[PDB]
Paper text:
Furthermore, we reported the crystal structure of heme‐bound AtHO‐1, which demonstrates both conserved and previously undescribed features of plant heme oxygenases. Here, we characterized the binding and degradation of heme by AtHO‐1, and found that ferredoxin is a dispensable component of the reducing system that provides electrons for heme oxidation. Finally, the electron transfer pathway from FNR to AtHO‐1 is suggested based on the known structural information.
Past biological analyses revealed that AtHO‐1 requires ferredoxin‐NADP+ reductase (FNR) and ferredoxin for its enzymatic activity.
Residue numbers in the entry: 71 to 282
């Protein structure tokens, strides 16, 4: 009742583990659901995660920049875009001497699924849009810090930097999400919310690469 973004957040928080957040109701079943403080990332797995994340963000950001669909065009130039930052960070790993892997199935499958939804199901597409970006600025930063401390000697990658002030950029996007949702039917809103589990499933398989 605080606007549709609060409904999306309520549904998403319920899908965390208690090992992740106060409101979480999921059991800790997989290795990527362990408390971040207990994670043991490797640079090799982290690179696979960054490459597979880059494909997903490339897909999201290209869909939005090239679209004339007013729902999608509302989210051009949010300040949250990550594709170029990830390119810079993949460049930094190359100069440190690491070889950059090719995108694997978790990134390819998610990127492919997002294109299909962008063409056919805007309500579902928006749900993934919200969960991918707003996860990254929430638990994603906790993961990035833990990875930086343990294996990167506190390098702060561009992936975890924003050109404006993060909290205002997020609230601007929240307002735009509420704006597009007010032109949806209640069922369409409901379809968006029911999509959240799929977003955790696809994102969860990418996060797992950090630990593989
Ligand atoms: C290791 C994995 C994860 C951890 C440790 C984590 C942790 C957190 C934490 C601590 C918060 C903030 C809770 C609060 O301040 O009340 C949060 C918010 C959130 N998380 Fe996660 N999370 C993880 C994975 C995910 C995934 C896979 C998704 C979705 C694909 C997701 C979606 C969200 C969303 C949408 C929010 C709301 C952020 C906002 O309101 O701006 N999280 N998460």
């Amino acid at each position: 009742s605080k606007g549709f973004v609060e409904e999306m957040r309520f549904v998403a928080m319920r899908l965390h583990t208690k090992d992740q957040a106060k409101e979480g109701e999921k059991e800790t079943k997989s290795i990527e659901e362990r408390p971040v403080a207990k994670w043991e990332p490797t640079v090799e797995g982290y690179l696979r995660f960054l490459v597979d994340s880059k494909l997903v963000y490339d897909t999201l950001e290209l869909i939005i920049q090239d679209s004339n669909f007013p729902t999608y065009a509302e989210f051009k130039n949010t300040g949250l875009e990550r594709a170029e930052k990830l390119s810079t960070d993949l460049e930094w790993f190359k100069e440190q001497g690491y070889e950059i892997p090719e995108p694997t199935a978790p990134g390819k499958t998610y990127s492919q699924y997002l294109k299909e939804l962008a063409e056919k199901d805007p309500q579902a597409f928006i749900c993934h849009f919200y969960n991918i970006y707003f996860a990254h600025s929430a638990g994603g930063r906790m993961i990035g810090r833990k990875v930086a401390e343990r294996i990167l000697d506190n390098k702060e990658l561009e992936f975890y930097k924003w050109d404006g002030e993060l909290s205002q950029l997020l609230q601007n996007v929240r307002e735009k999400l509420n704006k597009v949702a007010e032109e949806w039917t209640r069922e369409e809103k409901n379809h968006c919310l029911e999509e959240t589990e799929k977003s955790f499933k696809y994102s969860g398989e990418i996060l797992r690469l950090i630990l593989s």
